[PDB]
Amino acid sequence: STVPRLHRPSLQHFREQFLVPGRPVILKGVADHWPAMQKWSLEYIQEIAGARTVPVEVGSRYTDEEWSQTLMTVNEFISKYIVNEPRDVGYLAQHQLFDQIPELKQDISIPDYASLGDGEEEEITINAWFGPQGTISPLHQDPQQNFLVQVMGRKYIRLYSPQESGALYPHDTHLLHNTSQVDVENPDLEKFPKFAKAPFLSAILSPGEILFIPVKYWHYVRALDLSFSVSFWWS
């Protein structure tokens, strides 16, 4: 089934109907006027920080377990993995562009819906990153509440509740813990028969929209276009 969409709901409505019971929802009209929506482009990023060095994870396939960390400039990442056709797959490690490019911080705002949490102020972790069309983030479980905001490009997202964990064949990976062994969009049901019967929610997230991913929900993502995302994590 699909993720419900709400237009600028009251803080109390979001808290009681979605945050407390742990139900996913897409909030509209909340981030659509961030300056980032009208400013961020590859050109803008390169004008500010193209010469700055960022950590990049490189691997053979988005769904493989072989990943090594490297260091390259923003310009080099864009040239090798976005402008030209790469020989492998790469993504920005840790998704923390705000460390190397603090100038971007002024172009966003923390959604007020995140201060409904028991941890506020410096306890909100904020990540920003961009990546080429086709970037896949394998199905994995999140230890904190999450807002995912699309600035550029569309993303396909699939969500499973923690109640379905057993059907997702979890294991720990060198990169992160609580990852599914299943290829969400082309599952091998001979090896993973329970996956077929797990219900899920899915949506295509577009620029300006915020997806609320409740704590311990499982989520899978694929970038359908060149993508720029911002995520907020809190307890």
Numbering used by the authors: 182 to 416
Study text:
JMJD5 is a JmjC domain-containing protein, present in both the nucleus and the cytoplasm. Building from an extensive peptide-based screen for potential JMJD5 substrates, our results provide evidence that JMJD5 is a JmjC-hydroxylase, catalysing the stereoselective C-3 hydroxylation of arginyl residues in sequences from proteins involved in chromatin stability (RCCD1) and translation (RPS6). Consistent with previous reports, JMJD5 residues 174–416 fold into mixed helical and β-strand topology comprising seven α-helices, 13 β-strands and 3 310 helices. Like most 2OG-oxygenases, the JMJD5 active site contains a metal centre, which is octahedrally coordinated by an HXD..H motif (H321 and D323/βII, H400/βVII), the 2OG oxalyl group and a water molecule, which is likely replaced by a dioxygen during catalysis.
